[PDB]
Structure formats: C-alpha cells, structure tokens
Amino acid sequence: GHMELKREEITLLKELGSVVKLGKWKGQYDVAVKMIKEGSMSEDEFFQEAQTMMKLSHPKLVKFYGVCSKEYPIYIVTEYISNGCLLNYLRSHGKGLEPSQLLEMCYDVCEGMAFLESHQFIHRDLAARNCLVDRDLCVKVSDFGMTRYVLDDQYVSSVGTKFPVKWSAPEVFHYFKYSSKSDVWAFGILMWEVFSLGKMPYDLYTNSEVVLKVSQGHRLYRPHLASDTIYQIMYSCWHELPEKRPTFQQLLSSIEPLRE
Numbered sequence: 001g002h003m004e005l006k007r008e009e010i011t012l013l014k015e016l017g018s019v020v021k022l023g024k025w026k027g028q029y030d031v032a033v034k035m036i037k038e039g040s041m042s043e044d045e046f047f048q049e050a051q052t053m054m055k056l057s058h059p060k061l062v063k064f065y066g067v068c069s070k071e072y073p074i075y076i077v078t079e080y081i082s083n084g085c086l087l088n089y090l091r092s093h094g095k096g097l098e099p100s101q102l103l104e105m106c107y108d109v110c111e112g113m114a115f116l117e118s119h120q121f122i123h124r125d126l127a128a129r130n131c132l133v134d135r136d137l138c139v140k141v142s143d144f145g146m147t148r149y150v151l152d153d154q155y156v157s158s159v160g161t162k163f164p165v166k167w168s169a170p171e172v173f174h175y176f177k178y179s180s181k182s183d184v185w186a187f188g189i190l191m192w193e194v195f196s197l198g199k200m201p202y203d204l205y206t207n208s209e210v211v212l213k214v215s216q217g218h219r220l221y222r223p224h225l226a227s228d229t230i231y232q233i234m235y236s237c238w239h240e241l242p243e244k245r246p247t248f249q250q251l252l253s254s255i256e257p258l259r260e
C-alpha cells in the first residue's frame with residue numbers, strides 16, 4: 001500500500017494555523033502537516049478520513065500526500081498552499097483584485113465541487129474558511145473530514161458534526177437532513193463571500209434569526225463587485241427546494257462564458 005510516510009523525512013518548520021505546521025519533506029517538498037493529538041479524534045475516524053481524502057484527488061482539491069501514524073502526534077501531510085486561507089486573503093488583499101480574478105476563484109471551487117458531485121459526495125461546510133489560495137490565486141477546497149456520501153436527488157440524515165448555520169441549506173436546519181444539493185446552497189454563500197471580499201454573511205443577525213428569515217424568503221443582497229449575471233448564478237443556488245437548485249456541472253457551464 002501507499003499512505004504511510006517516513007516521519008524522519010519530514011522537518012517541521014513553523015506553525016501555520018491552529019495545529020497545522022509548515023514542513024520540508026525529503027529536503028525538496030514544501031508540506032503542510034496537521035497534528036492529531038491522542039483523543040482529538042478516534043483512530044478509526046482518522047483512517048477513514050485519510051483514505052477518503054486520498055481517493056478524492058483532483059487539481060482543485062487539497063492534495064493529500066500521506067500520514068505518519070506510528071506514534072503521536074499523528075501527522076496528516078498535504079501539499080503546502082502558499083497564500084493560505086481564502087477568507088484571510090479576501091480580507092487582506094481582495095480590494096486590489098480584478099472582478100475576473102474573483103470569478104476565477106468561484107470557478108476553481110465549482111470545478112473541485114463538480115468532481116465531488118461526480119462521485120456522489122457533498123461538502124458539508126463549503127465556505128471561504130475551508131478554501132486555500134495558491135501562488136497564482138488558484139483556489140483549492142479542503143474536503144478533510146467534511147464530505148458525506150449522498151445519492152443524486154436523495155436525502156440523508158445530518159447526524160454528525162454541526163457546521164455553521166449561515167452556510168447551511170434549509171433542509172439541514174428544518175429537516176435535519178442533507179440533500180445532494182445542500183452543497184450548492186453553500187456555494188452561493190461562498191460566491192457572496194468572494195464578491196463581498198470576505199464580509200460575514202447576514203452580519204447583523206443571529207443563527208436563530210437567519211434560520212427564520214431564510215424560511216421567510218430572505219436572501220443575501222448583491223455585493224457591488226458582482227455583475228447582475230453573477231448574482232443571478234449565486235441566487236439560483238438559494239432555491240428552498242433542492243430539486244430547483246442547479247448541479248455543480250450546470251453551474252460550471254453557467255460560469256464558463258463569463259470567462260471561466
């Protein structure tokens with residue numbers, strides 16, 4: 001098999017986030033190394049989560065390299081994505097970007113998402129916070145411990161980790177279910193985060209308020225940087241009925257003419 005890496009071939013350099021560290025693998029490759037402490041998660045859950053991330057390999061998804069599981073802390077090793085978190089990037093440097101570059105960020109996410117959709121997986125927390133920006137401003141989605149298998153046009157129970165409600169499809173908070181399109185709703189919110197340069201969606205409202213207002217028909221306003229056509233694409237993601245929302249394949253073909 002091939003998932004286990006030689007721990008001695010990884011030099012830990014600096015803390016990236018909280019714990020993820022920057023490292024050098026074999027004196028040649030830049031890596032990001034997530035530290036799993038004993039008790040933070042079950043070893044069975046860790047193994048399943050690593051195997052799934054490995055399997056869902058795609059240029060627009062974070063590239064899993066391997067694990068170091070012979071002792072604690074357990075390592076999950078991935079590629080090192082230079083520009084960090086998309087949310088921080090939008091907030092720090094967004095103002096300088098061209099609107100075509102913001103649209104390109106949405107296209108990257110949509111491409112990675114159409115891949116997950118092709119394998120009947122959904123991302124349970126599709127948000128800027130779970131996206132990483134490379135040197136060229138290309139976006140990669142992190143799927144680690146966040147995916148769920150759901151048959152096309154079906155529903156499954158929401159039982160598991162509860163993710164922020166402001167990115168959740170109504171079926172999630174109304175019916176305690178995910179649909180194969182719960183993912184698509186969150187993609188619209190991600191698009192809104194991109195075009196608003198990282199503003200908090202539904203800023204002035206609580207989770208209980210959002211749940212109620214969304215149920216009433218309230219949707220996020222158009223960020224000024226987004227064209228009318230782009231806003232119409234994000235809006236289409238927010239249909240109350242999953243069956244009325246587009247697929248990531250349809251979204252990809254809608255985003256493409258607008259220059260990818």
Ligand SMILES: Cc1nc(Nc2ncc(C(=O)Nc3c(C)cccc3Cl)s2)cc(N2CCN(CCO)CC2)n1
Nearest residue numbers: 016017032033034062076078080081082083084142144
């Ligand atoms: C927090 C952070 N991440 C960075 N890069 C990463 N690449 C891959 C990462 C990672 O977490 N992989 C991973 C995933 C996704 C799932 C499971 C397991 C793992 Cl291991 S984190 C860079 C960075 N920067 C700080 C701000 N600097 C601005 C200077 O201009 C840029 C550098 N900060």
